Amino acid sequence: SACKLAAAVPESHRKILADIADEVLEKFYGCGSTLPADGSLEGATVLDLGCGTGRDVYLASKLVGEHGKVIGVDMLDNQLEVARKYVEYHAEKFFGSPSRSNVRFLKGFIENLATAEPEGVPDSSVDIVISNCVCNLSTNKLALFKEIHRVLRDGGELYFSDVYADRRLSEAAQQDPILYGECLGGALYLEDFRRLVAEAGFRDVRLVSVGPVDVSDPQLRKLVPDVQFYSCTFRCFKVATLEATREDYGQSATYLGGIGEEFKLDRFFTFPREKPVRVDRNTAEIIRHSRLHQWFSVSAEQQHMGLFKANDSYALLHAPLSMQVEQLVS
Numbered sequence: 001s002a003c004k005l006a007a008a009v010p011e012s013h014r015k016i017l018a019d020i021a022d023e024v025l026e027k028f029y030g031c032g033s034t035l036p037a038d039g040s041l042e043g044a045t046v047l048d049l050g051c052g053t054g055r056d057v058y059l060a061s062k063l064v065g066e067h068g069k070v071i072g073v074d075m076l077d078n079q080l081e082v083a084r085k086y087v088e089y090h091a092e093k094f095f096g097s098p099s100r101s102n103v104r105f106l107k108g109f110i111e112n113l114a115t116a117e118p119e120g121v122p123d124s125s126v127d128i129v130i131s132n133c134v135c136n137l138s139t140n141k142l143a144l145f146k147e148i149h150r151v152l153r154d155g156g157e158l159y160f161s162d163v164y165a166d167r168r169l170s171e172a173a174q175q176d177p178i179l180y181g182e183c184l185g186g187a188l189y190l191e192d193f194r195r196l197v198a199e200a201g202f203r204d205v206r207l208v209s210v211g212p213v214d215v216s217d218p219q220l221r222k223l224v225p226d227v228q229f230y231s232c233t234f235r236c237f238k239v240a241t242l243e244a245t246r247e248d249y250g251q252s253a254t255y256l257g258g259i260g261e262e263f264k265l266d267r268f269f270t271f272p273r274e275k276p277v278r279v280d281r282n283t284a285e286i287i288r289h290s291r292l293h294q295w296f297s298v299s300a301e302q303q304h305m306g307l308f309k310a311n312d313s314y315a316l317l318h319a320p321l322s323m324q325v326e327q328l329v330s
């Protein structure tokens with residue numbers, strides 16, 4: 001019904017999740033994973049938008065390690081006061097519990113984290129911004145995405161899970177608070193998403209995972225007849241030199257190990273240890289300016305060879321976003 005792990009949980013996250021307070025997991029309902037299984041998180045500052053009971057906040061906590069930091073934001077006392085419960089519990093995980101926790105919880109609206117109350121979230125403080133089945137619920141999406149842009153460091157990354165549509169919803173369906181409350185009503189047409197995040201400073205969206213979402217309950221399915229709701233997990237890097245098109249300047253880039261046998265960046269790129277792999281300029285700028293430069297040697301720009309076609313799905317790479325997400329999902 002939208003808000004439920006609409007894919008399997010990744011392996012590494014399971015080991016952890018076992019150890020997460022069961023209360024936090026009874027409650028909790030987002031479409032799939034909003035946190036990489038890269039291994040790329042040690043020492044990061046992660047912010048969660050609409051964190052609720054803090055499932056993702058506490059999973060991030062273990063992932064970042066004792067010396068990274070997590071900040072869940074949520075608008076509701078009732079959701080926050082549940083997650084605050086287990087700060088100390090989950091400090092066992094770091095051995096020295098009642099003291100060793102990274103996490104903290106701010107109360108505020110995600111469209112404005114500068115007024116989040118315990119304390120605000122200043123400009124350029126965050127490495128990763130996550131969210132699990134929450135952004136579809138915003139009222140001013142452009143405002144939200146700009147806000148996210150204000151708060152990431154340069155080379156930082158919006159990496160998040162949310163529910164998206166085949167097509168714009170009818171004027172009617174927009175209004176229905178039942179539909180909206182099931183995290184379907186507010187969901188975005190994939191092409192309007194891309195348009196917005198770009199309007200807001202993110203010109204390069206990359207799709208990690210797509211999930212079938214089905215309304216079944218036909219009291220709803222009437223207002224959205226031919227719609228096909230999705231659950232997509234998207235990374236958008238904050239990097240000033242990205243263009244809206246994946247141009248090719250001759251560069252390869254090579255994963256050096258440190259994490260696993262291979263680093264998998266998106267559906268299109270998989271760098272295994274010490275094997276160079278050709279990339280478009282954006283993909284290079286991402287690696288260079290993000291936290292990734294440390295596991296990554298990256299060739300120099302050369303001559304422009306027009307649109308990047310060095311990939312075996314290059315056709316699709318350049319396709320609209322709707323088409324990308326029909327083809328994966330089939």
Ligand SMILES: Nc1ncnc2c1ncn2[C@@H]1O[C@H](CSCC[C@H](N)C(=O)O)[C@@H](O)[C@H]1O
Nearest residue numbers: 028029030050051052075076109110132134
């Ligand atoms: N405009 C807004 N500002 C801040 N938080 C919001 C919001 N609209 C909805 N939320 C929060 O969004 C959450 C949707 S439920 C998802 C909670 C969490 N991501 C999980 O998977 O458990 C709720 O906890 C709600 O409090």
Ligand SMILES: [As]
Nearest residue numbers: 003133134183
């Ligand atoms: As939801």
